[PDB]
Structure 1
Amino acid sequence: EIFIYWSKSHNFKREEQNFVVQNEINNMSFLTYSVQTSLIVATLKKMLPIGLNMCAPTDQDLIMLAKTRYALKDTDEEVREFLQNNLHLQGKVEGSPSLRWQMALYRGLPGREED
């Protein structure tokens, strides 16, 4: 959510730029203005695998779809609903045998049955 807020507010980005440049923070030893060296991106870059792990395979379609919807920039509520109705849409990935092994793995997790 922090990242998402950041990508919208231009003044937020310019302030990040001014801060990193004027106080002479290395942004290099921090890695050990460049947006990548900014910790704003790095937090999510490292934290992304967890979030993706929170979603089972059958959902990535909706993700792109919701990603598609964010091209229109549907409200949080709007994308939420446009994925709520498409409950039939995600699933039946047995028709996609390429997803079977991913499915089996995310089942074999300490995460329990399909709760």
Structure 2
Amino acid sequence: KTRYALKDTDEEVREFLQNNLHLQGKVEGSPSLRWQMALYRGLPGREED
């Protein structure tokens, strides 16, 4: 969303996300993500692939 605020096209944000894939949150470091991830993974059609 910050990159879109800087007037970037859909290609610029994608390559920005490609080089920043390691900044996604960790479940252990956040208590909120603990139950959200458990609830998210309980959906029928969720595949780890």
Provide the TM-score with structure 2 as the length reference.
0.82
1:70 positional shift:
0.5
Instruction: Report if the CA contact (8 A) 2:28-2:34 is conserved.
Output: yes
* Structure with greater proportional helix content: 1
List alignment gaps of at least 5 residues for structure 2.
none
Q: Which deviations, in whole Å up to 9, do the C-alpha atoms of 1:3-35 show, x marking residues without a partner?
A: xxxxxxxxxxxxxxxxxxxxxxxxxxxxxxxxx
Provide the TM-score with structure 1 as the length reference.
0.39
2:43 counterpart of 1:114 = no
Instruction: Report if the CA contact (8 A) 2:3-2:13 is conserved.
Output: yes
Count residues with an aligned counterpart: 49
Whole-Å separation in 2 of the counterparts to 1:83 and 1:96: 21
RMSD of aligned alpha carbons? 1.3
Counterparts of residues 70-89 of structure 1 (less than 5 Å) = 70-89=4-23
List alignment gaps of at least 5 residues for structure 1.
1-66
Q: Spell out structure 1 runs of 4+ moving beyond 3 A.
A: none
